[PDB]
Write a structure and sequence with these properties.
The chain has a single domain (1-88), classed as Arc Repressor Mutant, subunit A, CATH 1.10.10.10. 41% of the residues lie in helices and 17% in strands. It is built from four helices and four strands, in the order ααββααββ. It has a four-stranded antiparallel beta sheet with strand order 1-2-4-3, covered by helices on one side. Strand 1 and strand 2 (32-35) form a beta hairpin.
DNA sequence: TAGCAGGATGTGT
DNA sequence: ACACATCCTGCTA
């Protein structure tokens, strides 16, 4: 079973030493993160899944599919490149 | 420019 | 079934 996108995102967020210039917690407790380097996050996701055509347009389309699943959501005050984990 | 909401359909297990 | 990936239009900062 391939890694899921939400888990992949949590993985990058776990190690700011390695990935902090690409993606970071804005509010760790509330699960609010910012994508700082969208092209880079998409590039890393494409490598992980072996989709060399992956880009942020398509990565973010998959994040949006999470809205109705209650996995990721946009924060109360919506901001570009800012997202929020619903649970843990 | 670049990101964002969500439909339709292709891909691979 | 499931989780995307890949196309799309229209919308928004």
């Amino acid at each position: 079973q391939p890694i899921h996108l939400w888990q992949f995102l949590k993985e990058l967020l776990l190690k700011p030493h390695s990935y902090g210039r690409f993606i970071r917690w804005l509010n760790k407790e509330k699960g609010i993160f910012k994508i700082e380097d969208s092209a880079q996050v998409a590039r890393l996701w494409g490598i992980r899944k072996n989709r060399p055509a992956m880009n942020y347009d398509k990565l973010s389309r998959s994040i949006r599919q999470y809205y109705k699943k209650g996995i990721i959501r946009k924060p109360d005050i919506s901001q570009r490149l800012v997202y929020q984990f619903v649970h843990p």
